[PDB]
């Protein structure tokens, strides 16, 4: 009963804190806002599910993540979108692709270091029964 929602409240606070650390990292500025179809008109022809850190924050606040796993799915989507969309020619292209990997690696490192595995396992199993 009441305890299931304290897990989720605590997960959201943790996720808010991780996302804020990612979003203020200068390396990841390019991921803090949606890709702009006016600037990149062909983006929608490559990427079916856009994702960025400001959307991740909105999703946290709107209770769209019940697990760190679903949260990392969206981090992963940000990275995999950047790798699928951006070619590997220019230095600017390489830079944004490396940044996308570094975003994923940093989120995973933070979560590996700070997240209690039994707290995550509880989250996942509450999500299951529901």
């Amino acid at each position: 009963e009441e305890q299931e929602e304290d897990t989720f409240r605590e997960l959201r606070i943790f996720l808010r804190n991780v996302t804020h650390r990612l979003a203020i990292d200068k390396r990841f500025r390019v991921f803090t806002k949606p890709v702009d179809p006016d600037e990149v008109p062909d983006y929608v022809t490559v990427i079916k599910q856009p994702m960025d850190l400001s959307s991740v924050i909105s999703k946290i606040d709107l209770h769209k993540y019940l697990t760190v796993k679903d949260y990392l799915r969206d981090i992963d989507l940000i990275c995999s979108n950047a790798l699928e969309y951006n070619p590997d020619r220019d230095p600017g292209d390489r830079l944004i692709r490396h940044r996308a990997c570094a975003l994923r690696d940093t989120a995973y490192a933070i979560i590996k270091e700070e997240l209690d595995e039994d707290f995550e396992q509880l989250a996942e199993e509450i999500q299951e029964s529901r």
Binding site: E39, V40, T45, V46, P87, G92
Partner: peptide, 6 residues
């Protein structure tokens, strides 16, 4: 891949 940004 897409065209690329910039």
């Amino acid at each position: 891949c897409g065209r690329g940004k910039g």
